[PDB]
């Protein structure tokens, strides 16, 4: 039966809906108020395979921050909901991809422990409208809901557009392999402790 | 009524109970199986005021990380449960603290969000039998499983036990001040957003 | 009875009006024309518990500019009127705030001496719409009519809405304290020379 | 039918024994007298799908290296056995995996030909009773008794305990890959040059 | 009951009388004969509401060292002496102080063991007729005999005037703080190991 | 008549006792609980010609810190108590001495104010099992309770035992020294200024 992680989350400052599918079929269906934060999240489902739902409402009159960062953190939920135990998973994952002359490593491991390794240089503020610094802080709330350790290295890039939208992809595949069922495990939980948590 | 956490935590690494009064009399009563680590919570009780209990069993023959790790972890969600929605309090510490040559800065937030900065320079690896590397994972899980940011900044020290024993005498009376009731503030929560969470 | 100071302003380029209660219980109520600045000023009154009563209108067609100084100039005069001869009161201030990574240091001194020390290196230009060279401005203006010695210290910080958010809350509480009753000097002028002025 | 190798290996500073099957269920069963490093063939086995079961004994009152080393030999001949001719393998692994801070690269090839490439910094001298030095010569002999090219390359990390970790999960995760069936190539060898030898 | 010290000091170098009370009301009364020193002293009182008595003459035709030091012994003395026990004490000081540009930070503990850690870097020789290395000595001496960890750190100044009275103002304050009763620690020893002592 | 200073201090750390006699035959008699420092006492024995008799017992399985500094307290206090108003000694040691490739100097002044110059670069962290930080730790306690200025300088060695064991023979060489009768100042003060005192 198929994973599905889906939270509420509101606060004086947004209004967030979020419905996530591990075992989808690249449903893309995102509008977060932030136009480059969809056409991103469009990458996590049609590479990912995901199913992604997300509304999102919040005060972009001050900036996108607040919004950007309570996507995150609601992302972030559905993934621990729908992972629950996390039992027969492959746990780990590791993918490059490129766009262009970007290329961006990530490696995950759903381990329930939230850690984030960034070290993209994007060298303009804004892609669009969309201020640059919030990819960080967009992976940094996702890892500390979901419970993830996240590690995303730029090897190559010059054009934010294409380093950004790699990350988003490569992160899209990596996160599809942890996700993923390991063919050999026999629904084992993959920890030599015999419990994943994010406590 | 006195704010109360109380965890049982158990992997097939480790074995972990804890129970924190936040509005305590600084009752000191850690058992961790490192000896090192309880004299450091014994600050924890004696500065910040916070009745301290916890014991703790496990794979110490591989090393003390996983114990310490675990222990960490435990007493973040101890405070977690203790403080429930924030409600009245200062909700930020801060406090700068010595022993001898040893100047060890700690602020922190009790915002639900994880985050630690660190950049003690810990001049040994081992203090008595303790590695020194651990302090550094204690505040992190610590951080992670409470949902509070915590800045740690070394201003001076050579000695390995002095910089140490500093940086908890700094905690325990930065997080005294954070958990306390803001006598002004008539029991509302101390956020503009109107909300204090760790999701 | 409540110290209130209130401030009408206005020159061809704008229009203001503040009132501000020392003695609060933390109403927000700004409304600038600058909605960055607005989510600051609600810092302000949620951490420092004054209550903030701000309007302005201006040139914002020209820039943020003219009305973000005036609304400092303002609020400054409001402070200075508030506080009288500032008899029986802490003085000092001295409060460090994080906010995730960012880290900042505020310290400050009621004397009647208008001083600025200013450290803040904001990596982007803007926040929102809100360009991020007013942040000092807003500082500058606010201590050269309410007569304040203020020290601004960023000790950690990347993201460019979290070192300014920082700033203003750690500058809330350090003005909170400095503003609040000493209750040991018996209504005394907390001076050696015996007055405080701005004069 | 399943791939097992069995090694007894003695000589007057050690005694081994190891039975490895390739295609494990990650039946994990190793008491080598060093606790860390049976701690981290558990990992061997929980995340390569390893059965690993070894037994060792040695001159540890001297040092732990005679029987790190010979436990490496043991378990590189257990692997060359179990491969056999190498027909129909995947033959080259590639895994990147982290543990929180920790980020190890692990890429191998099983072409017979013994090379180890290593760049770890660990930053401590013991983790545990565990001399972090015996970590590479642990790879060191191993890929010399199996015929494997191996390269280790550290990308993130400060804790030693984690840095070692992530290794051999990484390490595992490529050597199960390596180790798997080709799904494509039929059972023939995954060499051009007809064979795949130590020779 | 008020905690008060007094000590007679006399050499052939100087003749020194102090008395001093840690609940007093800010009474100054301070004549060393070195005026500037008068006008330091008086901070002490208006800001940490001692109540300071000091009385010296000496041999300042040879310079105003051996007064300098002496006075500081004394007051030192006076104050272990009206610390007593130490118990139901905050024991630990934090308070950063400006003067104008001048910006100094004090943190001490009350521990009963003798250290100063000082950068202060005076760019004048002379304030007055007042030697400004006498600075670092009156406090060297201060915690010598009182039993006192004292750090005194330049964070930013350059009239040497306002380096002195900020650190002055500074180490006022945070005195102040730790000679205060703990209202929560029902008149215990703040101390793990149950005694604070000179010995 | 023999000066002999006699001490007994203990807290909930450790239990110590102390007796020294300044014009003593050698005896060595010192039981620390840590095997390393009583060989140093040793020669503090056989070189200064001090009867030194020490037991201490403490929490060594914390570390061997708090037994190492309060056993040097309550050394520094007996030296105090034995040479009472210091009439008719040298005051002033010099003396630098090897063990093999080291060479330690050592200068003191038995003046009542404690001063410590240190600046011993000791290679390794553990002589046996004691760690060598705290070897400044001692004699900073010691001179703290004494009330000595001492400098120790390290002009040559590589070897941790040499680089202690010299120290320790040249301090006792100075200390012999200092606390010896001068044999033409006819019992007086030696001091310009008529007194040498702790305070
Ligand atoms: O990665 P896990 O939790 O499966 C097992 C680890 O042994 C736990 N650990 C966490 N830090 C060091 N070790
Ligand atoms: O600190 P909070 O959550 O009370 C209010 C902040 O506005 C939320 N925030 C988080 N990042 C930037 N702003
Ligand atoms: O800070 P105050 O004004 O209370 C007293 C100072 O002595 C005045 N001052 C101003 N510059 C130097 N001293
Ligand atoms: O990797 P192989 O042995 O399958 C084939 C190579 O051509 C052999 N080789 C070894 N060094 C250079 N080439
Ligand atoms: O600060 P204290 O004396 O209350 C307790 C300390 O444990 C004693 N200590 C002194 N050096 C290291 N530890
Ligand atoms: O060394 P003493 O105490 O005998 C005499 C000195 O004159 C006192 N002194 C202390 N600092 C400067 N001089
Ligand atoms: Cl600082
Ligand atoms: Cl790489
Ligand atoms: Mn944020
Ligand atoms: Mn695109
Ligand atoms: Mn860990
Ligand atoms: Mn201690
Ligand atoms: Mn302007
Ligand atoms: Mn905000
Ligand atoms: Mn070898
Ligand atoms: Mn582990
Ligand atoms: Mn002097
Ligand atoms: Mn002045
Ligand atoms: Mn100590
Ligand atoms: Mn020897």
Redesign the interface.
Known sequence: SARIGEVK?E???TNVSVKINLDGHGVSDSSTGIPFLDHMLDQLASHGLFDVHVRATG????????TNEDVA?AIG?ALLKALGERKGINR?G?FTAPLDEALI?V???L?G???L?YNLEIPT??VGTY?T?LV??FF?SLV??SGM?L?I?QLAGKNSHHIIEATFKAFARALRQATESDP???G?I??????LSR?
Chains 1, 2, 3, 4, 5, 6 share one sequence.
């Open positions: 989350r606060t004086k400052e005060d972009t009159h001050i900036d996108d921050h607040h953190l939920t780990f590791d490593h490696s995950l491991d381990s422990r939230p850690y390794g503020q804004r201020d610094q960080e802080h940094q500390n809901t350790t590690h290295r050999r495990r026999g084992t993959p920890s030599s402790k015999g419990v406590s």
